[PDB]
Predict the structure.
Amino acid sequence: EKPYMIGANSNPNVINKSTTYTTTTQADEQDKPKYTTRLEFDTIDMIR
Amino acid sequence: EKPYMIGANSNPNVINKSTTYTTTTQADEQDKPKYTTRLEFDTIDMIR
Amino acid sequence: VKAYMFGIVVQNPDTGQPMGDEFYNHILERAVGKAERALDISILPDTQHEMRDYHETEFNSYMFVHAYRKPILQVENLQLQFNGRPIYKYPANWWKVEHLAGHVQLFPTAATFAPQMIRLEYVSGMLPRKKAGRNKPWEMPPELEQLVIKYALKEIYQVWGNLIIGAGIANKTLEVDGITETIGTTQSAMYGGASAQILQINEDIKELLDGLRAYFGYNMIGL
Amino acid sequence: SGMLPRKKAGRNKPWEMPPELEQLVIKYALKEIYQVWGNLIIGAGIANKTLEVDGITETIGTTQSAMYGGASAQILQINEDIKELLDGLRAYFGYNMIGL
Amino acid sequence: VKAYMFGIVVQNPDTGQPMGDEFYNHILERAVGKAERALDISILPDTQHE
Amino acid sequence: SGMLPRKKAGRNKPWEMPPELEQLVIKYALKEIYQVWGNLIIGAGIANKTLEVDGITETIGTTQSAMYGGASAQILQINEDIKELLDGLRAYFGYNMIGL
Amino acid sequence: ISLNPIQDAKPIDDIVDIMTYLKNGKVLRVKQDNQGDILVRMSPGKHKFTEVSRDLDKESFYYKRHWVLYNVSVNSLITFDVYLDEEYSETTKVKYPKDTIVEYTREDQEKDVAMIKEILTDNNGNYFYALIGETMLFDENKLNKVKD
Amino acid sequence: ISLNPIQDAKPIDDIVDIMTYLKNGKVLRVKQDNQGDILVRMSPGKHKFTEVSRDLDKESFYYKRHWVLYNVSVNSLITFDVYLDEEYSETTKVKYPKDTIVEYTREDQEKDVAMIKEILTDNNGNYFYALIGETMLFDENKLNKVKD
Amino acid sequence: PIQDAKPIDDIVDIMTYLKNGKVLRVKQDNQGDILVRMSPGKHKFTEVSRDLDKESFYYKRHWVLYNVSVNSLITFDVYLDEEYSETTKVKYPKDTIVEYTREDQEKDVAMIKEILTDNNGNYFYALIGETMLFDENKLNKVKD
Amino acid sequence: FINDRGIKVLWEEAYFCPCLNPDTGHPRVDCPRCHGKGIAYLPPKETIMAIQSQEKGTNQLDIGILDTGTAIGTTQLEKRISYRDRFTVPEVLMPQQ
Amino acid sequence: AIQSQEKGTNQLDIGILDTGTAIGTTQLEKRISYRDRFTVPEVLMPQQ
Amino acid sequence: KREDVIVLQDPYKVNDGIEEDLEIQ
Ligand SMILES: [Zn+2]
């Protein structure tokens, strides 16, 4: 009903942000994938 | 007679597909060819 | 749609999800809708309640009427009214139709204009084709099936073309410890990833669409 | 004045919204979105880059260019569809006439 | 809109913040306005005193 | 209405199908097939590639390009034949006339 | 003139209840430290096996989650906090969750630390905080967190 | 309302019958493990020699097979299954061939293993399976295979 | 009957016993048997052992960490380590492909449904789809 | 990239066996953990790794023939290999006589 | 900046020994001296 | 470096009961 307006910003200020270090752990994980094109040799043509 | 329509898919789902390993065997085989252009030196021009 | 994309799978690059059937239906509904305007048609069967004005020149011409939506599968009612009361309802056998053009004409047997005098009810659409390579004029031609498909594919390729590599990445190469991998895609600063196929689909639609307007023909109205 | 939402699939009454106006507005919206998203793929104003450190090297060439922006291909295809979509829809309403 | 952009996600590179629905609604409202001008139409139900 | 299959080689009666309509429909079919097959030669959207591992290297450059698809050459030659084939066949039927 | 209190997504500590829910087939969401947040599921039908999906949102008619077979580890469950996917949501990412000790300024200009026992929200989406020993509900800006 | 049973392509084990068929000139099809499926033939006429073709389809008016001379090995025949080309065909690549032991669910909710003795097909091209000890013919989805 | 086997059905019971700290025995396919255990102390994590024999003054088990998969537990058979029996001296193991003849002199294949014995040591076998008992000779061990 | 060009390989970390003699500082000839070698190993971890330059360098000496050569490998990210770690590639078979 | 980092191991009668070359590049205006010392808290090294 | 002077057997990996190339329906 009411018009949709941007309004004001909400992000607060942050100071002295420290880096993230990957934590060592013996526990298992799952490796986040990327699905995309694969490159391969033309082994048949290599035989030729 | 009836119109030719695509219909539904038939491929089932498969999970945990293992790789194919070429089997070692002393038996003979035949090497599947590819017929295509061949590159050669111009030996006559090499003589020149 | 998938069949025409045989060998291509539309999948998110960052997760294994393929796009669902619902999106295809949503696109297909807009593909058939776009076609319904692009050739002025009503394509799916639907019932119409139509009021039309009285023009003397057409009325004397056996009560000629040009339906707003075509083809006309059939006509249920054809009545003349003055203030909502039917002044005269014609016999069924009198009136006759031209299905494809939608002309409605009356053949009686044994100011110069007024608004909304007559009332017309009819069903606009096309039936699915019963037999291969053939269609009745009241029957869906095979080209509309392919045309609507090609319209849908224009949308699907517009989506898929962004998922080829990365996001807006044309050329790449990685060189790691003497390993080397290198790719150059169809994406370019002045051409989109699927724009090769989209261009070919335009060349296909232009041949198809023009050839089908010849089946329906040009519109005409007297003045 | 206005249009009711479409009740039945693939159909609309004259008093009823054709699905393309829905799609047309979507495509006008996407024009703005791609005009935003095209800037953020890699930094800003970066067309070509290559970086080599300690025996590992990478090269990337973006769709960004001096002559055209990174999303320009998507926008230009959106225009090609909108023009067809809009020209066809104008035939549903027709030209405007007034006596004088 | 997101469906049409399936597989593309937009974020502020300096943060983890993707644009909220507020922007989309705002854009969509001006888009439906633009289409309403592109054909001389009224595109939402609205009473008129003429 | 329609046409009978051709009985004798290289010949047709007016009530009989000329062999080119058979060929013309074939060429229209091949347009769709090549529009499919052109996508599947190498991955998708890949124009150029080169790969080097452990002293063995390979480079391939496909017919794919930003401006034209991999099968575009075949399609464009099919069009060149269809236009000649179709223009010539229209002379067998001729133009349409109606009085007014 | 407000909205009723909003429950926080209770982490599950006992492995036994986790396994019982999994056997029941209810979805689980695992916060992996290294590689983000993932969903975990038991395959339906006779061929029982664990499945993973990174389609990290509530299931919707227009957004159907895709499940990949994975050999989820017990240690992963134990060391990583796990939540029921019916609860864990973007609805309320409150800066000061329930049971968190926070520092608040009292009217006598003496800073005190109290544990948040109840949290609710209002029309504007604000986060009203209830602290033990006081009835008046504080606001986001007034409070402060003390870490370590 | 069905189609009569379809014979499976019997593999040939005895070398003697293989050689006899070859001498008669009947075509043979050899499933090589490493490099796919090939045809084997004896040359017609006086100049006898073995020939190979990879034109791997039934001979047709529009598709004539081309034969290359090759020194086919006895060991190749022995170690590799060989079929008569008149039989081996795409017509029925049944998931559970004849004489295969398959696992089927009985009405008493007890899984049993039985050997397929007869297989047939119907209008839809389905694969009806006959199992020893039972008269009702099962379907593809109901059955299951156990390997090793 | 014979008391040489007491397999666990539910994985929930397995996890409950692991919480109690009791050791488990987990079979494998064409591979060595495994023992599984929950580590004690502050940090809880699974541990495994390739050894099988009982602990003694002359024999001690070795334990190491491993990311055990629930798939193995749910699929493979599991027993309590203390109550496991090494072998039941029968020709055919349980869940093994066997061949027999039906009442109408028709040959049929099946798997062993139950392993039984009398007080004199004579062993009787029951097959799937066959309520009656079969002699050891009447059965035939099918080759893989 | 690494998952693409690599080969599946089992990564097992190395650690000195407790069986080392406390006085001489050299290992027992035979024990379950290490078969005479003074270094034991942990359970394997499935991993994809790239390998290059693989060499079967043969030295013929009075003691006999000996197989030793250099092979250069490249790992994934976040993996911290240690000295005398062990890898085995089931896929690849090597002829010996 | 640091490059070419090497954990060169020498096995000798005295025992194993870790020694290797690492090449670094500083900022401007910094005048390093012989046998200066650096430590990188971020990077951890495994030892046994 | 290759393992010739001292040889140890392949490590005892823990197997999974998931059948490889498993049909799903
Ligand atoms: Zn030792």
User: Anything to note?
Assistant: Strands of chain G lie at 28-32, 36-42, 50-53, 68-69, 82-84, 101-105, 111-121, 127-131, 144-145. The longest strand of chain G covers residues 111-121. The interface with chain A takes residues 32-36, 38, 52, 54, 70, 72-73, 75-76, 78-80 of chain G (CB under 8 Å). The radius of gyration of chain G is 19 Å.
